Design a binder for this molecule. Structure first.
Ligand code: NDP
Ligand code: ZN
Lengths: 145, 87, 209, 129, 342, 115, 96
């Protein structure tokens, strides 16, 4: 088991569904002995022998820029195009569509809460899940105090 | 093995310095992928980038080749020489 | 009266100080940049640095000015402005009892000429600025560090300097002496987020752009 | 007009060694400038009208005594204000801190009319006040 | 590791290193120094004591508030040991005297006390134990000091299989009773070396070196079970060593030839004082006993520390004994003694 | 903009001159401050510390900055010469109680979260 | 109420109790873990439920100016007892 850092402890980057690459800054240090997720990989590589060239955050961002130049440009949608050639590119297999009705995995507010590891770890998520499941009179928390 | 594992293309959005490659993938890409369906021709298009080409072969080695103002036939050749060298 | 809480307004002193401000502006147009008198009857003169010696001398010597007392000398670091540091000279008159203030600007490196001769009280005050803001003073008789500890670094009143400093000192038996160590607080300074997001004084609103 | 033996000095200021900041604090530390977003719990606006710079957060461990929040980096609760981002970035480079830039996000002005609360055919008609 | 034991900080006073020491008998010489390295890095030491806490106030500065908790302990009490080591991860044994107390015999402070320490420690569940014992310890050495230390080592190792036994050679450093010993030997007339002391080689170590080695052995993962030997970089024959320290102190040197039995008589005479005898018979049977070489014992540099030569750091220790005629003199005036190397 | 006011030195050559006799004074000082302050420092390992501190600010190229370092070293020289400084402050340059700090990335990862 | 830990320590009103290993218990050997017996959790529960007969009830906490700021609690909900947030006395309608 290699403990890692959560999304509020690292200083890494994520991408929205529209392609814009945003950055998450470090809020609180990772608990215990867990380090960041790229630092541990690089240290693992250095110990194993096949050392990676990058050593701090700016170098790994530069390397990721080398891999993809859109993933460093922050908070601006990198204009995506070339759809028609992609359409003409697949258009070969048939893979006849099954008659199974389309049902998203989330169908009611009860399953909107319990999706990821963070949600499962949470207790308030379970409290609201059980609020939704049975009925109204299950989760009354005194608000005056 | 040493045969190339993925080929990455970084072309600018509108700037004329990357115009030629934009025409290349415009017409000379679909059959190129049909020729090597297994091969990941990645096109990580972006803005204000000089038209550049990465080539990752095996073991984590990568090859750098610029395509600054490269014509469509010229970029076709600079892809063909790399693809032919399946090693 | 109708305004028992609001402070009294003394417009006579205001007009008279404004007249003297026009006076001093006309007398030395070479170094003076902008003179204005505050609402509470306190006049300030914004001069170019090269006028540190001349203007002060004119304020120290002139018969109709007659200011010989250096109340205090201070710098006010503000990182925003191009020349971050601004130096304030506070003068008090005896024959014409009143308080005048002259203000100059300098960055970290551009030296500002040392008064000392105009006001021999400035000397120690002068040293403080150099030892507290980094503003070196040209041909100051002895610009050695004055306040901070021996072998210190930086200039603490700079707004970038942290509140807790950089290095503490404590006994070490391994070397049998007081030693300097990098900062490691036992409890970190909690920085409260005051200054409510609602506008306080409409009069002093910054113009838009 | 201001003769003081002036000299062209092209390279930017390097007051770093003058500031006395230790080597790892001037090198490792990364500072970002930004306009602080208003607290959504409030509708007040005059807190996103300045350019503040702040530094990357560091280790925050709990002391054995009461579980306090002892830390090691002195430049943690240090935030500097600036009128325009140009002054802030100039300060950052001349001091020597690796800086990050975020553009001043401002609210887009939306067309608002009370006559939209009611309508003859538009969906925007409200159902309660 | 326990949730209150994860290392935290940056090695300062308030850094939580993750060490809970015990430093038994830390109220003296190296006990003062090791706590320093334990206090400076940040670790809740549980330093026990038998004397008056006055002779322990000098441990208060060398630690942030909430550290170096003091607990009363008695030698002939297993319960006191249990109380001191109930909540610890490392137990450090430094309890050892040099003169035979009329109440505490030599062996108890060197086998019975260490044996009880090891037994109660192992019962408690402490991870690592570091017992200290003279390098020259031999079962049949003429001095009962080394003999008792050898039986104590074997007893502790039997009781605590993974104890990290440390065998330091003669140690110097401020209050040393070795450098200051020969330095004050002028007080008792001319220096009475046994047979003028041309036949005794010594391998001294700087106290900071041994203390740092103890700290690394705490941090070292493989230190369990092993037995380290602490030796200096260079080794001096006794006569030139005394020459060097006297020259550093600039006090005139008057070597005095002496038979072994005559020095035994003098040691018996000195053993009758009622407080801290300047020398003992056992001390005489120690000084002429040269320190052997134990290459098969893992040394000091393998731990990570670098041995500091005696010439560099003799100034501070011998500085006080210098009179004002040469109290202003530096190191370089004294040329390093003719070390007899390998 | 580019034009600026000097402190003393006009060009890199004259500031280069000022640091020269600053090092002169430090050289002639080190032995008798070792003697006077009863330093545990040795003469050679006194001089090399001066050399390493002078080499520490090797990157500086702006003149005014060089005048600033030279005048600050001048203040340091006065503080040392007439015994206003104290032995502890002199030792402050030598980092004794400060534990060695690792440099490689692997040790940094082992110790804790820090770049 | 104050209860003993499995180790033997007296738990606090907040629920603090050092665990089995919990090396930070040497602080209490040769000393004591100072805990207050007058638990505020239960010293307010046994107080009688006031039966004042009005819709909305004022509460200053007793002592007038010496009490807490005057709050108007609502004795409306039939299924529970209204209580002042500051002090904690439970107010209820006299069974309507
Ligand atoms: N050059 C050297 O000094 C060398 C020393 N050693 C070993 O190092 C150990 C410690 O040496 P050092 O620190 O110089 O010795 P000191 O006598 O200077 O200090 C002994 C320490 O243990 C305590 N102590 C000693 N005897 C007793 C006792 N009978 N009962 C309770 N506590 C006791 C002392 O406290 P208190 O004063 O209250 O008794 C003090 O904390 C000994 O085992 C010694 O043989 C090994 C090689 C070389
Ligand atoms: Zn109440």
């Amino acid at each position: 088991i290699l403990p890692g850092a959560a999304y509020t402890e690292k200083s890494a980057t994520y991408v929205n569904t529209e392609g814009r690459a945003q950055q998450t800054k470090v809020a609180v240090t990772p608990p215990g002995l867990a380090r960041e997720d790229w630092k541990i990989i690089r240290a693992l590589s250095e110990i194993a022998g096949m050392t990676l060239p990058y050593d701090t955050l700016d170098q790994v961002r530069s390397r990721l820029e080398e891999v993809s130049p859109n993933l460093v440009r922050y908070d601006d949608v990198e204009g995506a195009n070339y759809f028609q050639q992609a359409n003409e590119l697949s258009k070969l297999v048939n893979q006849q569509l099954l008659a199974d009705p389309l049902v998203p995995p989330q169908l009611t507010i009860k399953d909107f809460y319990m999706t990821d590891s963070i949600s499962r770890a949470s207790q308030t998520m379970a409290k609201c899940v059980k609020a939704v499941t049975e009925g109204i009179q299950a989760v009354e928390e005194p608000s005056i105090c | 093995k040493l045969g190339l594992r993925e080929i990455r293309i970084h072309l600018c959005q509108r700037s004329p310095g990357s115009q030629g490659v934009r025409d290349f993938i415009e017409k000379r890409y679909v059959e190129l992928k049909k020729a090597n369906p297994d091969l990941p021709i990645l096109i990580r298009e972006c803005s204000d980038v000089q038209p550049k080409l990465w080539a990752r072969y095996a073991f984590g080695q990568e090859k750098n080749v610029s395509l600054n103002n490269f014509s469509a036939d010229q970029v076709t050749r600079t892809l063909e020489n790399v693809l032919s060298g399946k090693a | 009266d109708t305004r028992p809480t609001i402070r009294p307004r003394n417009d006579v002193v205001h007009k008279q100080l404004s007249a003297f401000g026009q006076y001093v502006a006309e007398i030395l147009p070479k170094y003076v940049q902008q003179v204005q008198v505050s609402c509470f009857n306190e006049l300030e003169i914004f001069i170019h640095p090269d006028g540190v010696i001349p203007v002060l001398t004119f304020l120290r010597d002139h018969t109709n000015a007659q200011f010989k007392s250096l109340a205090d000398l201070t710098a006010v670091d503000v990182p925003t402005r191009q020349n971050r540091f601004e130096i304030v000279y506070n003068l008090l008159s005896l024959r014409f009892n009143s308080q005048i203030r002259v203000k100059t600007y300098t960055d970290e490196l551009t030296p500002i000429e040392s008064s000392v001769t105009v006001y021999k009280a400035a000397n120690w005050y002068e040293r403080e600025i150099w030892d507290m803001f980094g503003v070196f003073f040209a041909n100051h008789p002895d610009l050695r560090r004055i306040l901070t500890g021996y072998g210190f670094e930086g200039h603490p009143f700079r707004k970038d300097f942290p509140l807790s400093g950089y290095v503490e000192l404590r006994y070490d038996d391994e070397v049998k002496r007081v030693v300097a160590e990098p900062v490691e607080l036992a409890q970190e300074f909690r920085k409260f987020d005051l200054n409510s997001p609602w506008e306080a004084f409409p009069a002093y609103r910054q113009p838009p752009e | 007009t201001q003769d003081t033996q002036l000299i062209a000095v092209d390279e930017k200021l390097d007051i770093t060694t003058l500031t006395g900041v230790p080597e790892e604090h001037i090198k490792t530390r990364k500072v970002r400038i930004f306009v602080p977003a208003r607290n959504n719990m409030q509708s007040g606006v005059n807190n996103t009208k300045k350019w503040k710079m702040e530094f990357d957060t560091r280790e925050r461990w709990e002391n054995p005594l009461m579980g306090w929040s002892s830390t090691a980096d002195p430049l943690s609760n240090l935030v500097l204000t600036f009128s325009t981002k140009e002054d802030a970035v100039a300060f950052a480079e001349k001091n020597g801190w690796s800086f990050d830039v975020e553009e001043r996000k401002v609210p887009k002005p939306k067309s608002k009319s009370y006559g939209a609360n009611f309508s003859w055919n538009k969906r925007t008609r409200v159902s309660t006040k | 590791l326990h949730h209150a034991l994860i290392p935290h900080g940056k090695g300062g006073r308030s850094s939580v290193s993750g060490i809970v020491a015990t430093v038994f008998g830390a109220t003296g010489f190296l006990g003062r120094y090791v706590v320093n390295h334990l206090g400076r890095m940040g670790s809740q030491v549980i330093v026990p004591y038998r004397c008056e806490p006055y002779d322990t106030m000098h441990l208060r500065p060398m630690g942030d508030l909430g550290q170096i908790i003091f607990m009363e302990w008695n030698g002939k009490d297993k319960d006191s040991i249990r109380k001191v080591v109930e909540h610890s991860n490392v137990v450090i044994n430094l309890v050892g005297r040099e003169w035979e107390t009329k109440n505490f015999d030599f062996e108890d402070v060197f086998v019975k006390i260490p044996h009880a320490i090891a037994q109660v420690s192992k019962e408690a569940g402490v991870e690592k134990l570091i017992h200290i014992s003279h390098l020259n310890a031999d079962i049949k050495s003429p001095s009962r000091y080394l003999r008792s230390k050898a039986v104590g080592e074997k007893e502790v190792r039997a009781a605590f299989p993974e104890a990290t036994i440390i065998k330091p050679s003669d140690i110097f450093g401020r209050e040393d009773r070795f450098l200051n010993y020969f330095a004050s030997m002028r007080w008792f007339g001319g220096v009475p070396l046994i047979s003028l002391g041309k036949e005794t080689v010594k391998q001294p170590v700087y106290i900071v070196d041994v203390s740092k080695g103890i700290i690394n052995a705490i941090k070292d993962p493989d230190a369990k079970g092993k037995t380290f030997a602490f030796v200096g970089p260079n080794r001096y024959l006794l006569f030139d060593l005394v020459q060097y320290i006297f020259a550093v102190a600039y006090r005139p040197f008057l070597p005095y030839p002496l038979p072994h039995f005559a020095y035994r008589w003098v040691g018996r005479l000195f053993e009758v004082s009622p407080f801290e005898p300047w020398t003992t018979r056992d001390k005489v049977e120690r000084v002429h006993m040269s320190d052997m070489t134990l290459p098969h014992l893992p040394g000091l540099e393998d731990l990570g520390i670098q041995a500091t030569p005696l010439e560099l750091k003799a100034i501070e220790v011998l500085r006080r004994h210098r009179t004002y005629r040469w109290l202003t003199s530096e190191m370089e005036d004294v040329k390093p003694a003719k070390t007899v190397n390998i | 903009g580019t034009s600026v006011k000097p402190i003393f030195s006009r060009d890199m050559n004259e500031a280069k001159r000022r640091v020269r006799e600053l090092y002169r004074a430090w050289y002639r000082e080190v032995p008798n401050t070792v003697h006077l302050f009863q330093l545990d420092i040795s003469v050679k390992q006194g001089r090399d510390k001066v050399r390493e501190m002078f080499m520490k600010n090797a990157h500086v190229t702006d003149p005014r900055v060089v005048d600033l370092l030279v005048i600050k070293g001048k203040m340091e020289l006065e503080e040392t010469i007439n015994v206003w400084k104290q032995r502890t402050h002199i030792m402050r340059f030598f980092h004794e109680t400060e534990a060695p700090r690792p440099t490689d990335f692997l040790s940094k990862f082992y110790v804790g979260h820090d770049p | 109420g104050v209860r003993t830990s499995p180790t033997g320590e007296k738990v606090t009103h907040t629920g603090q109790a050092y665990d089995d290993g919990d090396y930070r218990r040497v602080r209490f050997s040769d000393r004591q873990k100072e805990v207050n017996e007058n638990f505020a959790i239960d010293l307010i529960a046994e107080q009688p439920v006031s039966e004042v007969g009005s819709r909305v009830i004022s509460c200053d906490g007793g002592g007038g100016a010496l009490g807490h700021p005057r709050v108007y609690i609502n004795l409306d909900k039939e299924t529970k007892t209204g209580t002042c947030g500051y002090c904690g006395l439970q107010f209820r309608q006299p069974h309507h």
